[PDB]
Design a protein around this motif. Structure first.
Motif, short mmCIF file in Angstrom:
data_model
loop_
_atom_site.label_atom_id
_atom_site.label_comp_id
_atom_site.label_asym_id
_atom_site.label_seq_id
_atom_site.Cartn_x
_atom_site.Cartn_y
_atom_site.Cartn_z
N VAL D 35 26.69 94.47 36.31
CA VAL D 35 27.73 93.61 36.86
C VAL D 35 27.34 92.18 36.54
O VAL D 35 26.18 91.88 36.27
N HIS D 45 18.27 95.95 42.01
CA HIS D 45 18.38 96.68 43.26
C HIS D 45 17.01 96.76 43.91
O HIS D 45 16.02 97.03 43.22
N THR F 24 41.75 95.29 52.68
CA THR F 24 40.93 94.40 51.88
C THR F 24 41.79 93.29 51.31
O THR F 24 43.00 93.44 51.14
N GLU F 26 41.64 89.21 48.99
CA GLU F 26 41.00 88.19 48.17
C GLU F 26 42.09 87.24 47.69
O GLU F 26 43.27 87.61 47.67
N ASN F 183 32.64 93.95 55.33
CA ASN F 183 31.66 93.66 54.30
C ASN F 183 32.30 92.76 53.26
O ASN F 183 33.50 92.83 52.99
N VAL F 184 31.46 91.92 52.67
CA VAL F 184 31.92 90.90 51.74
C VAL F 184 31.40 91.24 50.35
O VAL F 184 30.32 91.81 50.19
N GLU F 185 32.20 90.90 49.35
CA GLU F 185 31.88 91.18 47.96
C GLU F 185 32.12 89.92 47.14
O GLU F 185 33.04 89.15 47.42
N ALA F 186 31.27 89.71 46.15
CA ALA F 186 31.40 88.54 45.28
C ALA F 186 32.45 88.84 44.21
O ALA F 186 32.24 89.70 43.35
N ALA F 187 33.57 88.14 44.27
CA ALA F 187 34.64 88.29 43.30
C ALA F 187 34.87 86.95 42.60
O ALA F 187 34.31 85.92 42.98
N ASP F 194 32.16 82.59 41.75
CA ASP F 194 31.72 82.92 43.10
C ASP F 194 32.90 82.77 44.05
O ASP F 194 33.45 81.67 44.20
N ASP F 196 34.82 85.18 47.65
CA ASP F 196 34.61 86.24 48.62
C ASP F 196 35.82 87.16 48.69
O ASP F 196 36.95 86.69 48.86
N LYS F 197 35.58 88.45 48.55
CA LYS F 197 36.57 89.48 48.80
C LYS F 197 36.13 90.26 50.03
O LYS F 197 34.98 90.71 50.11
#
Lengths: 100, 50, 50, 50, 233, 232
Positions: D35, D45, F24, F26, F183-187, F194, F196-197
């Motif tokens: 990624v 990881h 979800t 974004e 939970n947060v994901e880098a989108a 950078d 947040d999703k």
């Protein structure tokens, strides 16, 4: 400066050639970012001498390891100066104290 | 002597203080050591080796 | 490992101890509401499969 | 800006071999499905660090 | 009863102790909500409060930040660093140009800047540099922008503006006007009713923003973001 | 502008059950995802009004650790069964319900004596099991509306010793939500690498649709903040 030190920083900076040390005490006559001019005391002059000393400060030159070497004046106008006093802080140095 | 210096400055003697999480906001269950450390930067620059 | 061990550890006296709770979902509700500490010993209903 | 989108497209399932010098055992080379992150350091990881 | 209704707090109290330090009071806040609003307000204030910073320096004879000018005890880079510390309030125009000139021996301050009436300095006696020679004189031109957050010159050069002159100096931009936020909540005594709480916010800034306006703007952005959630299908 | 901000889109609503869902969205600015997630978690868990069963009285039981014949389930067990009854009340603030069974088999939640203002949403729930028709179990449950979760310790008081002999108190979670986890994901959007999703996984009882749940929570917070906005 390091808040927690061992007391050796003064000596290490003094002996190391990084800093400019006034060879004769007196009162500072002229301060500039590049050069410093000092006026020696009345009892310090050689009989028949100008009584004025000049130092040139290394401003920005390449180091041996490609890092930066710079020097900063650290005295005010009309500041009395004793012999052995640090007159130009070098890199990683604060008021004559080592500051990595 | 370090305890005496701490008590002179009105800091808690134990040297461990409570903290709050920035994103959640509730206290951390146990007190956490907070202090001042001398940290250096080393010549192994990541943008040089990459 | 530290987190797991701290999570499973018990303390004899804790907030909300003794209460009986229907399931782990409500255990999550209780703790995330700060109404019962992590180390509280309680009686809960669980299900397992084989 | 289209180049970045294409880049996301191509790496969608293309694994990369990843090695740490020096290889001591056959677990020293592993393949991951990548990624994209900003910066100049490879994120790993935590588990496989052992 | 009255479970289906919810009370609305008010900005009951505002006090200024330092020009860069204020504390305000929100009342009444019911149970639980106090932390929700405290965290939300603190995070938003630390993130997105608008500010004005300095992203341009032009000095007579200075070709780059690594050079030196005679008659100045300070090297150019440290001058730039002190300039970062400068705070500016502008309300009538998004970008502005300031001017500094001085020939006398001694320290220089932000009070010495040549400015219009719409530009205000919060901390006038803040030092910029020191001059040491009678015949020498400092002469600077400064450009102030309005922006949000932090944007380094490394990202700034991505604009790739053409014909950038040699005698131009780029400086890092930090806009955020608040330095610290603390929130503390505790039970209040209003309408003799229990289970209410008063929320006190404390914040140190650089004195460029009214606390009331800042908090209102934070509320505005939070509500605007929530407007997506309220509309969910 | 500085006033302008990135506006997230409602990308999807992935439903798993009538009570389980994932929502979800974004894009969100740095920290906004966590801010909104924490706020929603607190609001849903601790401030969403709802109705639940709080007080019970069984004929013949002295206290929580009493006993009753015929039924294998004990007093604590029967009350924790009564813990999970999904019930919603139409308009009425405070209502009383009663049930009484005798039969070899299951005492199901569908058997409850219906009242017009009371709707049990998950009726097929089995209250208990009874071993003999020679035994009878009669209980009276009590339903109130309110906010948040209340444990028993906050109601057990010496000043409240007026409670009649043979009364039980139930830890009642009025809040319709069972679980909120964000939970947060880098989108990325455009070249902004950078951003947040946000993914919310959520669970309720039968009374409330998850979309409505989140909607209501947002509504309450927005209303709680309405006057501080100088805009419309």
């Amino acid at each position: 400066k390091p808040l927690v030190g061992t007391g050796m920083e003064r000596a290490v900076a003094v002996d190391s050639g990084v800093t400019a040390v006034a060879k004769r005490g007196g009162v500072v006559q002229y301060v500039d970012a590049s050069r410093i001019v000092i006026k020696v005391n009345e009892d310090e002059m050689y009989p028949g001498e100008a009584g004025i000393d000049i130092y040139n400060l290394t401003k920005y030159t390449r180091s041996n390891q490609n890092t930066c070497i710079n020097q900063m004046p650290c005295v005010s106008l009309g500041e009395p100066v004793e012999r052995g006093d640090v007159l130009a802080d070098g890199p990683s140095t604060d008021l004559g104290e080592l500051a990595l | 002597e370090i305890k005496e210096l701490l008590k002179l400055g009105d800091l808690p003697t134990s040297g461990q203080i409570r903290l709050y999480d920035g994103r959640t906001g509730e206290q951390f269950e146990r007190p956490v050591t907070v202090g001042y450390m001398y940290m250096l930067k080393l010549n192994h620059l990541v943008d040089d080796k990459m | 490992v530290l987190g797991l061990y701290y999570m499973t550890r018990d303390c004899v006296n804790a907030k909300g101890e003794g209460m009986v709770l229907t399931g782990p979902k409500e255990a999550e509700r209780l703790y995330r509401s700060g109404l019962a500490s992590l180390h509280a010993r309680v009686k809960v209903r669980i299900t397992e499969y084989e | 800006a289209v180049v970045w989108d294409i880049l996301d497209e191509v790496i969608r399932e293309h694994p990369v071999l990843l090695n740490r010098a020096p290889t001591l055992h056959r677990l020293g080379i592993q393949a991951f499905e990548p990624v994209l992150i900003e910066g100049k350091a490879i994120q790993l990881h935590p588990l496989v660090c052992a | 009863g009255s479970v289906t209704e919810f009370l609305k707090p008010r900005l009951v109290d505002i006090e200024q102790v330092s020009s860069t330090h204020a504390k305000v009071t929100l009342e009444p806040l019911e149970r639980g909500f106090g932390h929700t609003l405290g965290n939300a307000l603190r995070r938003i204030l630390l993130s997105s409060m608008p500010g004005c910073a300095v992203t341009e320096v032009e000095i007579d004879g200075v070709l780059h930040e690594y050079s030196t000018k005679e008659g100045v005890q300070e090297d150019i880079l440290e001058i730039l660093l002190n300039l970062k510390g400068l705070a500016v309030r502008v309300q009538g125009k998004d970008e502005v140009i300031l001017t500094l000139n001085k020939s006398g021996i001694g320290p220089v301050t932000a009070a010495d800047i040549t400015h219009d009436g719409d530009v205000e300095i919060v901390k006038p006696q803040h030092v910029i540099c020191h001059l040491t020679d009678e015949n020498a004189s400092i002469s600077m031109r400064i450009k102030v922008q309005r922006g949000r957050g932090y944007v380094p010159a490394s990202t700034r050069i991505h604009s790739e503006e053409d014909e950038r002159p040699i005698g131009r100096l780029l400086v890092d931009a930090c806009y955020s006007p608040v330095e610290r936020i603390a929130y503390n909540v505790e039970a209040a005594r209003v309408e003799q009713r229990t289970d209410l709480d008063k929320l006190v916010i404390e914040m140190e800034t650089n004195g460029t923003i009214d606390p009331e306006e800042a908090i209102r703007r934070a509320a505005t952005i939070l509500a605007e973001q929530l407007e997506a959630f309220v509309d969910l299908r």
